[PDB]
Amino acid sequence: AMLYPVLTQSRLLSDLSGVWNFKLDNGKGFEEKWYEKPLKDADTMPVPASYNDLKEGTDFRDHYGWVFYQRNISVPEYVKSQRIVLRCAAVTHYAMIYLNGKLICEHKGGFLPFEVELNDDLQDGDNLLTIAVNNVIDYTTLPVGGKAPQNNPNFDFFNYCGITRPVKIYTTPETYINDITVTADIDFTKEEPSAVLNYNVEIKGITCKVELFDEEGTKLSETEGSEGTFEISNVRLWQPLNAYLYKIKVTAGQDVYTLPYGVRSVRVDGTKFLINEKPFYFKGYGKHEDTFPNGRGINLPMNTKDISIMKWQHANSFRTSHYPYSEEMMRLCDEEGIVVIDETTAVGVNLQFERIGTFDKEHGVQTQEHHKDVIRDLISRDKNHACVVMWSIANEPDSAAEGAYDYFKPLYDLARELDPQKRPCTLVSVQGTTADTDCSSQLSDVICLNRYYGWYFGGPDLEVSETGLRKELSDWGKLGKPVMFTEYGADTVSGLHDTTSVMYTEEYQVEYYEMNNKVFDEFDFVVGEQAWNFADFATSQSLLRVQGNKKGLFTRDRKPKMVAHYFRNRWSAIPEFGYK
Amino acid sequence: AMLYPVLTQSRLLSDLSGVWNFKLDNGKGFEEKWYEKPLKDADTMPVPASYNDLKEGTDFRDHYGWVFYQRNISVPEYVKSQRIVLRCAAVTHYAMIYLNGKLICEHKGGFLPFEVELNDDLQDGDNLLTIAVNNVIDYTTLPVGGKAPQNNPNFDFFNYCGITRPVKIYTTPETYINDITVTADIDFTKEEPSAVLNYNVEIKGITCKVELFDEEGTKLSETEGSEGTFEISNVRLWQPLNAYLYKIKVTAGQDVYTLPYGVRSVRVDGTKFLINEKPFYFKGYGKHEDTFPNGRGINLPMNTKDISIMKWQHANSFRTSHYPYSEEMMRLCDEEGIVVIDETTAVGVNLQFERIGTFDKEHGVQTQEHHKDVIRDLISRDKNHACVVMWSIANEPDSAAEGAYDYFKPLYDLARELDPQKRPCTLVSVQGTTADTDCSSQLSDVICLNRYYGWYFGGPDLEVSETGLRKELSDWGKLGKPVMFTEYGADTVSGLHDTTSVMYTEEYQVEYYEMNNKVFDEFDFVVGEQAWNFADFATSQSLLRVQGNKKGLFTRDRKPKMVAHYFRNRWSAIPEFGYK
Ligand SMILES: CNc1nc2sc3c(N4CCN([C@@H]5O[C@H](C(=O)O)[C@@H](O)[C@H](O)[C@H]5O)CC4)nnnc3c2c2c1CCCC2
Ligand SMILES: CNc1nc2sc3c(N4CCN([C@@H]5O[C@H](C(=O)O)[C@@H](O)[C@H](O)[C@H]5O)CC4)nnnc3c2c2c1CCCC2
Numbered sequence A, B: 001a002m003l004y005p006v007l008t009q010s011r012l013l014s015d016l017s018g019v020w021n022f023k024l025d026n027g028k029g030f031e032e033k034w035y036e037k038p039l040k041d042a043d044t045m046p047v048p049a050s051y052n053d054l055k056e057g058t059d060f061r062d063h064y065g066w067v068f069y070q071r072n073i074s075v076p077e078y079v080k081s082q083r084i085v086l087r088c089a090a091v092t093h094y095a096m097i098y099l100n101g102k103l104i105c106e107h108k109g110g111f112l113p114f115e116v117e118l119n120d121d122l123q124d125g126d127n128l129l130t131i132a133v134n135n136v137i138d139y140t141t142l143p144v145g146g147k148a149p150q151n152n153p154n155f156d157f158f159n160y161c162g163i164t165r166p167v168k169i170y171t172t173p174e175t176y177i178n179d180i181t182v183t184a185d186i187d188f189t190k191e192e193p194s195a196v197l198n199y200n201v202e203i204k205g206i207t208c209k210v211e212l213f214d215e216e217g218t219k220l221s222e223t224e225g226s227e228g229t230f231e232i233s234n235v236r237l238w239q240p241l242n243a244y245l246y247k248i249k250v251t252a253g254q255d256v257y258t259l260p261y262g263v264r265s266v267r268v269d270g271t272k273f274l275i276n277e278k279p280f281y282f283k284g285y286g287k288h289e290d291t292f293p294n295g296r297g298i299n300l301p302m303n304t305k306d307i308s309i310m311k312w313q314h315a316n317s318f319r320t321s322h323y324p325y326s327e328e329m330m331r332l333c334d335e336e337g338i339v340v341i342d343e344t345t346a347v348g349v350n351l352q353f354e355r356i357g358t359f360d361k362e363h364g365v366q367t368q369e370h371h372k373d374v375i376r377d378l379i380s381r382d383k384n385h386a387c388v389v390m391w392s393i394a395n396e397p398d399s400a401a402e403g404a405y406d407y408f409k410p411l412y413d414l415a416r417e418l419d420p421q422k423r424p425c426t427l428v429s430v431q432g433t434t435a436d437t438d439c440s441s442q443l444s445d446v447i448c449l450n451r452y453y454g455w456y457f458g459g460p461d462l463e464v465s466e467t468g469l470r471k472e473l474s475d476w477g478k479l480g481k482p483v484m485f486t487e488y489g490a491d492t493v494s495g496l497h498d499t500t501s502v503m504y505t506e507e508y509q510v511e512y513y514e515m516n517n518k519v520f521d522e523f524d525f526v527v528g529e530q531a532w533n534f535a536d537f538a539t540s541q542s543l544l545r546v547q548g549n550k551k552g553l554f555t556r557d558r559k560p561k562m563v564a565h566y567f568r569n570r571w572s573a574i575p576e577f578g579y580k
């Protein structure tokens, strides 16, 4: 369980972000005890941020192995009173915290938070904090390092690493709040729908009371109970592009924490994805925590810029593509009313492109245990987010291979059981699968395709490509379930133009999406269009990557390609609800 | 009078185009007799083409003065039988032909054809042809060289010079055809309109008979008479975007020449520009004979490409901006059905931007005599072109200054009297004039404005700019005449993009034209929208020119800016006829 550190009367918060000392491991790093003494001949390195692009030459950009972040720490003795904790929101890949020279914590997983307490190794005076980060990826990591001394991603984005998100120090009373959970039942029956919310607070280390406020701070109800309930008639339902967030003050044993919460219902019904009992239609794109020169590092300004562009463009949703995003971005979609598809680090679980099969148990992937710890850690983190309407177990696994069904079912189950809101589960299907062959047809509530008819398939022949896409999508309808496209797009170099289009031209990109959009619009069970990608992003080099991935509607610096004006006009004529 | 040299049973045609010898005058050129001996230490230089960009360094690009083209010539004695003529379709600025060392011809005016006969200095064997070209521009040239050793154009395009169009050698019988003229009267009354055409052939140095064919070569009528007539019931009327061209074989004294001709009526009526008695609406742009690295040189392929793009874009017209275009392009618009506004070299007749006034007679411009010879030479050349529906006496003269009316009336008159079809006359008004102040309000059948509300005026404030444009255009309506915009646009660097537009961005360009187009659409007396410019073109350097003029809808190599897709959608929903 991981609550978002905030400033409360009961808890303090001090950011450690800034320029830290930094050294690339030379192999002999751990041998000598760098985590013991202050790094020598060190380099400077802002935190929070990916370090790959922040220096010059390939030696930083393409480093294999470990790096050492190092910074000094010092708390006021008058604080030992309360509990001292170190929250690392995300260290890409493996983290190893040393204080004063001793290991204190260790973590696997580059995109989710982890904490460690400091009360009993926090010395007096100036303490030597050391965070060593490893970037190696393999068949035991999610995301999955392939075989082709260098990391070779089995995924189409660059392997940005370092202290990707912030490192803070918060405190707490000795017995504290540790995990608040809230769910809602809404009775749309009444012409003025109302709702009953179920609280479930948890403490560790006494009386606990719950206060419920409205948008403006107006209190409206109170109760006591580490597992009580609450009633709200004439309830302001959170809605896509129309967020309403209540707030919640849990006072419990000299400790109080506040939580926003939006009241809405998610439910699949036949070929309809329903939000607050209405037939939604996804409009938006798959995104990437990718900016220059931050790498995958957190970027509050671009977060707001990205959401400003989405509203300008008349979109309503995005998918945390290939990894969970920052907590800040998740809260922002709550405030702004952005429907989010929250997705795990499970990309590259596919060895298809003697031959080893993906789910061979001696020579194939070794990810299921960690895949489970991710599903749990992620749902623990974002369970209370009204923006989250669905979960994505994995992006493009070899889901039509043998071993496939056996791999994923234990993970779907774990997901369906750990979501206090029992939200729809899916996985994003790669090109090649079909209704009959895809283990997703059974395990998933929503069929999410990534199809590229007009690019990989059939490009530059958009007629032949249309025939293919009708044929395949037609078949997908026989499952009687909601199907949305989570990726489709074409690599386009901003600036390349032509009257009779050729591939890579802004005109070819617009035509591609006209064909796909025409076919989408023929099937009432298509409940979503999400283009890949929102914006150009960095990938590993290869002959097929024109200085990265150029499938964005926008450039890496958020300037619109012609296609961005095509979608803005199309999405403006398509409602959040009732499109079918 | 100048007929377009073609291949006829009576006349031969041999192109002299190719790589000629070429030398930049060093001042001492004429002193020594370069036109006498073969140039020494010469350079290579294709003809036909502007020479400025065909070499490296500023020394070619920015040469002040004379250059010497030189090529060898040799005719088969068995030709002396017939008349031998040298037709120079266009030598930019001043031309001076030498044969074997003797001057044979001289010309002023860089954009119209001129010929000279060779029978009596054409030696036997190999003859030394020499064409010396001068690029100097001043208050006595059209276009007008300003005061700010270098040419400073008082016009916004680069001063490309050299043998701009081709040099050929044709022959003729001794008594020959010299100028055919045809006009038409159509009786739209009948439900199957018919027409009577009036021939007017001219010979110099005998029987002459006229044959009339249809599109496919089917003869349909014959007659005799150097000034006879002809009748055609159920006539195929040439029409915008629907050309029908009859042909005409004038056999006369062992000499025959063929001429295409289209039957259509042009007539202004109130606030309506009527073609074949219907209310036309101009759709298109102002263009420039500008390609790389040809300079202003002729370019048959780009001519066809430009016309292909216009049909793709759903345009119907263009203006020979700032100079008459090649004969080939003029014939092409006949074949393809492009309405053309034929315009003279008279740009820069405006000194506004002790102070000298434009039409001061000692210190101002000295162009009226030549301006007249241009009006005559031009109408003599293009009189029979169905594509030509209007004449432009001058682009942006100081038409609201004193002396203005006196300057232009003699030229309007000369124009209105020399057009066998009595076609509408105009001049294109610069920013600043108004209905009351513009000598064009009286002399012109169509008010043609060049306004820049949104750029020079008011940019980046498109609201304030709209208020200005409504205010001014409103007033222009009080004249009860047809008003079309012949220029409006905004400098746009292909590739610069933004969601919240800034000037120079493809998005700002599209918004500019949306505002102007909205206001245009409010006034039923606006009969035309022609954007400036069709494509990016070269200008003299200055702080206000981003590597030339970037106001094109297309780049200099004909690739579309976003705005080119905005117009194509708008023009597709606007008819050639009946828009009002
Ligand atoms: C019709 N038959 C084909 N089907 C396919 S599929 C495929 C392929 N994957 C697709 C799916 N993406 C997904 O989409 C995005 C992207 O690819 O840009 C990624 O950014 C994103 O992270 C990822 O989710 C990951 C990788 N990569 N390369 N070639 C192909 C290919 C080809 C053909 C025909 C021969 C040529 C290649
Ligand atoms: C609203 N008040 C103004 N009005 C005007 S007018 C003007 C100006 N001319 C206009 C008209 N063009 C014509 O249009 C094209 C073009 O300009 O690109 C040319 O290519 C084309 O050959 C030619 O026909 C020739 C030149 N050049 N520079 N500044 C201005 C200016 C300015 C202001 C305010 C201050 C800033 C400058």
Ligand SMILES: CNc1nc2sc3c(N4CCNCC4)nnnc3c2c2c1CCCC2
Residues within 6 Å of the ligand: A350, A353, A396, A430, A431, A432
């Ligand atoms: C794991 N992600 C991928 N998935 C796929 S699928 C497919 C294909 N197709 C699919 C349709 N059926 C016929 C064969 N052809 N070539 N490459 C691919 C392909 C690739 C990758 C990533 C590595 C590069 C190629």
Ligand SMILES: CNc1nc2sc3c(N4CCNCC4)nnnc3c2c2c1CCCC2
Residues within 6 Å of the ligand: B350, B353, B396, B430, B431, B432
């Ligand atoms: C001959 N072509 C021009 N015409 C014009 S008109 C105008 C203006 N305006 C017009 C509206 N009334 C208020 C003043 N301001 N600045 N420059 C100009 C201007 C220029 C040129 C060419 C040289 C550069 C400037």
